[PDB]
Amino acid sequence: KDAWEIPRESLRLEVKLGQGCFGEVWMGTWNGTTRVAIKTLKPGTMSPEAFLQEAQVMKKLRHEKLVQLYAVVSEEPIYIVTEYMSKGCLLDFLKGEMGKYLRLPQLVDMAAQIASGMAYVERMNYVHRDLRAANILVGENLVCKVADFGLFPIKWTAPEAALYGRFTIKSDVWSFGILLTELTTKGRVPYPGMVNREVLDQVERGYRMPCPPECPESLHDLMCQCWRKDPEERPTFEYLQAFLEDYFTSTEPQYQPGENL
Length: 261
Ligand SMILES: CC(C)(C)c1cc(NC(=O)Nc2cccc3ccccc23)n(-c2cccc(N)c2)n1
Ligand SMILES: CC(C)(C)c1cc(NC(=O)Nc2cccc3ccccc23)n(-c2cccc(N)c2)n1
Known about the structure:
Helices cover about 35% and strands about 15% of the residues. The protein is of the alpha+beta class. It has two domains: about 1-85, Phosphorylase Kinase, domain 1 (2-Layer Sandwich); about 85-255, Transferase(Phosphotransferase), domain 1, CATH 1.10.510. The strands form two sheets. It has a five-stranded antiparallel sheet with strand order 1-2-3-5-4. The radius of gyration is 19 Å and the shape is globular. One of its GO terms (molecular function) is heme binding. This is Proto-oncogene tyrosine-protein kinase Src. It comes from Gallus gallus.
């Protein structure tokens, strides 16, 4: 065994956080005083090999804005242990009590962190496949990090990805565009009123969501750039990041606080 492997009694599973039928996720403590999130396998549901294929991927991906692997126990019972992101998922964070105080400058900063996480994925030649607010984790002081809860999200998926299976970093770009509409509507589901097949049909014909209320036209323009038909036309995460980091100087220097944004 290797560097990640830790003894089982060095963990304390304190609070149940979530359960699917492939296992559980707990908030916990590792050795002394180290808050951790601990993921569990429900025995019988998937291959011990296949469950630990997740931490096999997280060992090779290290960056400030992707959730970080801490430890691995690799005989049953097995556990994957990461840093604790204390405020939960970005979708819940936008919708809940705390979603009503977020204004355009906190939201654009959030998008810039995620672009940064995604710029690193982009430089690593990796592909997310499921970039959306449900898979972004939030910590203290509005820190965001890219994650994957490992669950059909046609509403967040590019036409070439949904129809023909061509998932690339260019399809994660399209979803980032969709993630942007999530931030600007406080977590609302994209294409309001529309069902999957009506979405898949309207979009092929050239439909793209309109500027959300109070959101600046220049930010809708970036979503629209992320939603080009031709995957290669779509911008780079290095571009998306720098454009969001620089936003209130280069692009909307006369921005003024509103009711929701
Ligand atoms: C199905 C599966 C993978 C066991 C699961 C687990 C969770 N929930 C979480 O993992 N929640 C949390 C993870 C990490 C830190 C958290 C901090 C505070 C509250 C929840 C957290 N899930 C979840 C539940 C509800 C919404 C979202 N976005 C994710 N889903
Ligand atoms: C590409 C990237 C963003 C570095 C990533 C991260 C993960 N894994 C996770 O995010 N796992 C977890 C998500 C949410 C809560 C967790 C709590 C404890 C342990 C892992 C968690 N990934 C992953 C890889 C392979 C399979 C699965 N399901 C997930 N991928």
